[PDB]
Write an enzyme that holds these catalytic residues in place. Sequence first.
Site, short mmCIF file in Angstrom:
data_model
loop_
_atom_site.label_atom_id
_atom_site.label_comp_id
_atom_site.label_asym_id
_atom_site.label_seq_id
_atom_site.Cartn_x
_atom_site.Cartn_y
_atom_site.Cartn_z
N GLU A 11 24.17 -34.30 19.95
CA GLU A 11 24.90 -35.05 20.65
C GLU A 11 26.50 -34.97 20.95
OE1 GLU A 11 21.22 -37.78 20.90
OE2 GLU A 11 23.16 -37.80 21.89
N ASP A 20 26.07 -39.94 29.88
CA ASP A 20 25.21 -39.06 29.17
C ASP A 20 24.49 -38.39 30.02
OD1 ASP A 20 22.18 -41.30 28.30
OD2 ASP A 20 23.14 -40.52 30.01
#
Length: 162
Positions: A11, A20
Site C-alpha cells: 500500500e 487510490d
Amino acid sequence: MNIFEMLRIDEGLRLKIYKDTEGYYTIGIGHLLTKSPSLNAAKSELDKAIGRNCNGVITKDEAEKLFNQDVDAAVRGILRNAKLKPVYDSLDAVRRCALINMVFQMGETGVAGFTNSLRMLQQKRWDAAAAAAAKSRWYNQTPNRAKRVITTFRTGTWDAYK
Ligand SMILES: [Cl-]
Ligand SMILES: [Cl-]
Ligand SMILES: [Cl-]
C-alpha cells in the site's frame, strides 16, 4: 516479515489525501476515506476518523493508528465471517497473512466472492487456488500486487516480498 510489513509494501505510506488505484480518496497506508468524488467529503471523513481538523494532512503516528485499526478490523472480520473463518483456520501462518491482505484490499464480501479459490485453499491445492484467483478483475487491475499475494498462497513463503 509480518502482516504490517507486507501491507506497508503493497500500500505504501502517504500523509496527504490521495487517490487510490480506482480513483478513490485515501490516506496513510491504504486507508479508504470515501468513494465520493468530492474532496470535501474526503476531508470531512478524515477529520471524523482522526478526531481533529486535519485539512487533508496527517502525521505518521496518525497513519499508523489508522493502520492498526484497519488490520485489526480485517482480522476480526475474517473470524466473524462464516465463509472465511474455516479457510483461515485451515491455513498455516504465512498463508493466513495472504488472506488478511486480500480482505484488507477488497473487503470481506469481495474475498468471499472467490468461491472456488477458497475451496481450493481449504483443500490445500495450492496451484489450483492460484490459477483460479488469477481469473479476476482483481488480478487484471492490480497485477503486480495480485501476483505477490498469489505467490504467497502458492508457496507459503515470503519470497515475493523479499
Ligand atoms: Cl474463485
Ligand atoms: Cl478473467
Ligand atoms: Cl499492482
